[PDB]
Amino acid sequence: RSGILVFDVNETLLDLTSLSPLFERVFGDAKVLREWFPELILYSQTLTLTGLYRPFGEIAAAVFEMVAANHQAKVTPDDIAELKTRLTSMPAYPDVAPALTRLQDAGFRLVTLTNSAPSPAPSPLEKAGIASFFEAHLTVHSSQRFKPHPSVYDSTAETLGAKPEELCMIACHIWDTIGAQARGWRGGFVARPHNTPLTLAEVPQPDFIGRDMGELADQLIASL
């Protein structure tokens, strides 16, 4: 191939529903995961737009505390440490290693790009035992701005020496595929639970959609 596939990590490759027990316990309702996560992405974009930056994991903790205060749910230091443990150790979906193997076989290069900032080894993908598929692990940290800011995609292309037509952003987050496609990359959307494309005039739809990573990999392979 000449294609480069750029993957989001948490939720896209690693199972975000592994956080459900923390929400079930603190909130009495595991479904609060789906209010906390968009609040987190909301505030990461607020900092970006307003010219502020803190590491993504810090924002995740601060937003967990805020969502807890909104529900009048008590939160301890142990809960926050458990949040950190879980957020940084999500297990790989079982469809991932099979799909990545097949993409590697078909000649695609594989890299990661995350809102999470670099941290000491082992990384989430190393803990999940799938870091080895990837040639490089990139983050937003050098941009000091979060997705979908254009600089995060542009600097990633620059870093890799790749043209937009050669890059595909793979994510279960429609905000991430919109961000990459606005810069001329392709977007490949994996429909992990609780993610659906936004059907809105003038909003680009993903170039490729799969219900799981194997089905997405199918489509990327067929596209040549």
Place this chain on the structure above:
Amino acid sequence: PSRSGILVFDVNETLLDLTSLSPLFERVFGDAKVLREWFPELILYSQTLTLTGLYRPFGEIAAAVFEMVAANHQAKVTPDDIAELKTRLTSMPAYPDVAPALTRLQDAGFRLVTLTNSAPSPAPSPLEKAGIASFFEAHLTVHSSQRFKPHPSVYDSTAETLGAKPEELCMIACHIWDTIGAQARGWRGGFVARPHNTPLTLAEVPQPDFIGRDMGELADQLIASLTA
């Protein structure tokens, strides 16, 4: 004191009651609490469009995000549900604490204006329907700029339009992202703690200058402090 302060108010949720949408969520999702998942999804995507150079009117995003959240919950949505969303979003009633607080603020010498993500519509506006538009000297929106809060241009263009300096301006909202947006521009931020909104405590992030649990308590604080 001869005040010169200009109080710029967010409209929906801040002045007008967002929980008037609860029956629509109760019906579509079987759970009114899904209001609190859809609303941050809506704000998230408005900021995404802004960051990527895209724009559609806020109410259109609001509808498309309602469809999206419904699909995520595997809940059927009909055209009647979408029409109800549009009607509800443009007809939220004023909280009882609003008119007395605005009366006190006006009588204390503050200038009052609104600034909203929502696009202009033919008259009457939501504030007009609710009967509180007359407190305000101007009603501004992001639509002509095609960029949503908290993009810095929203606040800078508002200051320019009003011929005001950041030191004279205070953004009033129950949305912490909006007070962060204004305070990043050198304005002050007045937070009203409407249900389900709490300051984000995070280093190097602006905390509101004034916090009240309702508009009366916030007005107590503005009158006491903003005397210049």
